[PDB]
Design a protein around this ligand. Structure first.
Ligand SMILES: C[n+]1cc2c3c(ccc2c2ccc4cc5c(cc4c21)OCO5)OCO3
Ligand SMILES: C[n+]1cc2c3c(ccc2c2ccc4cc5c(cc4c21)OCO5)OCO3
Length: 575
């Protein structure tokens, strides 16, 4: 028989092959950093220094023949293409008319972006996240933010994955106009300009390739030379652990929506939709797309953008066109892909889209039932309430009244139910609506007892400015505090108030607050009671479930309350 091939491990890239080529120690344009191949190029060198070499080689993966070729004397390179990622035991055999002889088996890795080469992720979840057996029909969603791996020190293996159905990854930018990104300061705008170098306008890109696929996470077993690292390799390993989990890229958001206003021109929609198809072919762990345009008709970060006439029909066309494209991917792959969108729920945001037309293309609408009131001005109110609070004036709730100046309200007040009922009354099906819960508070200072028109209710006061604090307190921006910061610095373990704060609850609105009457610090948030009220409301109206912004800010209490409030319930999944 021929001499058995001896595999040259270092001549064959120690048997590590990848379908994706990712640049590693540089930051450049997206199309220069990311190159995906439908088939991996496998090149394995072997030698046969003694004896006869034979005529032909065969390569086996786990005892199955996957390639064959000619022997070339004493040193041969087996070259072939392979599609399916995984870890395989490889043997190389040499054959001639006298017989065949085979190398010892050795493990070969073919990396792919579905995580097929990876073991299930090792988790490190805060144990205050509890176990539930919520029915698998109900949505339990959250947003994981790409930058939460920095100061917030919250990584993919911290997520309480068994308590989630959907993880929306915030956020994928669109190349083009992006002045709003400069409002976050720091290097966000410049990092986008780098990502977009050599990329056509209106195509998606990864904003932070260090966080997405370059950073080595030791908890995930990453080495500097591992071919895919970052949050994305951890999400691929998480999908191996929990295969029914849906992980969906969220495109846009508050700071990244400026390009959507040019989608009134179909040519820019076509560029965008094609780039999303390419993105989902490149990054296989993703299960759909979420469109967070804030907002059709304007009222978002860009004060000079928004067209009430034209943006709704553009949004609807976008959804139509994305569902055509996702149907093409479903034909090509055999997979199911979801199309979702997070939307404003103030009456003035809902009126700018005919959701009765859009929702036929969509699996879910994530209703942004939060940010109703906040530190952008000095008017207290409930930022995430279901219903109208005690603080509101007569006729403010339904918008028939007049304000303190005598001027008509322009529409119903900002509450979750006023927006959910506007959506239901136009025919959006309840079982496509997902209710938002806040894992943060918004707040003010200067709300001292002398400013209250009703002494029992601090939401009748007036502020002097935004809540101030430090990042150790969960205050990453003035006026906004992580829930886990409110619990550590204002509520305490028994939920009865520490550090000079008192807890209160507006039972009409279903909304909690903490108030320090000495500093005038007042914070509006969601807590166990108000999240149980949202779950009861969702069960009552047959909504699809609940989601939250943002998972790094919880300590487990808010996601536990989301499950607790949904106990016993089931829903019909959208078809
Ligand atoms: C995109 N980034 C990169 C960062 C970063 C840091 C620290 C903070 C950030 C950051 C903080 C807040 C952000 C907020 C954002 C954002 C991006 C960021 C953001 O885009 C959407 O709104 O050290 C390395 O790189
Ligand atoms: C000014 N801002 C910044 C935001 C923001 C976010 C998320 C939401 C907001 C936001 C939401 C509602 C708002 C409503 C407003 C406003 C500002 C905002 C507002 O000014 C007038 O009424 O992550 C980046 O930064």
């Amino acid at each position: 028989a021929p001499t058995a091939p001896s595999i040259d491990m270092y001549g064959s890239n120690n048997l590590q092959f990848s379908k994706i080529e990712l640049a590693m120690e540089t930051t450049s344009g997206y199309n220069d950093m990311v190159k995906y191949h439908e088939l991996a190029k496998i090149k394995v060198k072997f030698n046969q220094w003694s004896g006869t070499s034979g005529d032909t080689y065969n390569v086996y993966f786990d005892g199955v023949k996957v390639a064959t070729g000619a022997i070339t004397g004493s040193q041969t390179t087996a070259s072939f293409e392979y599609g399916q990622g995984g870890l395989y035991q490889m043997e190389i055999e040499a054959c001639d008319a006298t017989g065949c002889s085979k190398s010892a088996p050795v493990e070969i890795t073919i990396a792919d972006t579905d995580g097929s080469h990876l073991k299930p992720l090792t988790m490190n979840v805060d144990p205050n996240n509890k176990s539930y057996n919520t029915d698998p029909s109900i949505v339990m969603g959250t947003y994981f933010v790409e930058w939460g791996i920095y100061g917030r020190d919250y990584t993919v293996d911290n997520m309480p994955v068994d308590n989630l159905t959907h993880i929306l990854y915030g956020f994928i930018p669109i190349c083009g106009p992006n002045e709003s990104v400069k409002s976050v300061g720091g290097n966000s705008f410049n990092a986008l300009q780098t990502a977009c170098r050599g990329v056509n306008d209106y195509e998606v890109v990864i904003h932070d390739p260090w966080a997405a696929y370059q950073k080595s996470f030791p908890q995930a077993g990453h080495e500097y030379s591992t071919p895919i690292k970052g949050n994305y390799a951890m999400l691929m390993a998480l999908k191996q652990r929990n295969p029914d989990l849906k992980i969906i890229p969220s495109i846009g958001g508050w700071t990244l929506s400026d390009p959507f206003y040019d989608f009134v021109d179909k040519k820019n929609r076509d560029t965008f939709v094609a780039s999303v198809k390419k993105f989902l072919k490149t990054w296989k762990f993703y299960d759909g797309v979420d469109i967070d345009w804030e907002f059709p008709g304007g009222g978002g970060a860009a004060a000079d953008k928004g067209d009430p006439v034209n943006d709704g029909p553009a949004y609807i066309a976008l959804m139509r066109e994305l569902r055509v494209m996702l149907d093409e991917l479903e034909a090509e792959t055999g997979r199911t892909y979801e199309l979702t969108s997070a939307i404003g729920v103030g009456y003035d945001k809902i009126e700018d889209v005919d959701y009765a037309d859009a929702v036929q293309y969509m699996d879910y609408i994530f209703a942004m039932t939060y940010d109703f009131y906040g530190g952008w001005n000095n008017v207290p109110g409930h930022q995430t309430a279901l219903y109208c609070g005690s603080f509101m004036r007569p006729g403010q709730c339904d918008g028939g009244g007049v304000d303190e100046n005598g001027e008509p309200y322009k529409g119903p007040a900002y509450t979750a139910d006023n927006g959910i009922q506007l959506l239901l009354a136009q025919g959006v099906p309840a079982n496509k609506l997902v209710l938002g819960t806040a894992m943060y508070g918004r707040g003010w200072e200067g709300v001292t007892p002398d400013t209250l028109t009703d002494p029992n209710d601090p939401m009748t006061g007036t502020a002097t400015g935004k809540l101030k604090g430090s990042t150790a307190q969960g205050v990453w921006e003035d006026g906004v505090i992580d829930y886990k910061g409110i619990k550590s610095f204002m509520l305490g373990a028994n939920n009865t108030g520490i550090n000079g704060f008192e807890y209160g609850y507006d039972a009409q609105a279903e909304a909690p607050w903490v108030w320090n009457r000495s500093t005038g610090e007042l914070i509006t948030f969601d807590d166990h009671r108000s999240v149980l009220a949202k779950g009861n409301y969702a069960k009552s109206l047959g909504l699809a479930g609940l989601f939250s912004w943002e998972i790094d800010a919880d300590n487990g209490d808010i996601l536990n309350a989301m499950h607790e409030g949904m106990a016993g319930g089931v829903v019909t999944p959208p078809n």
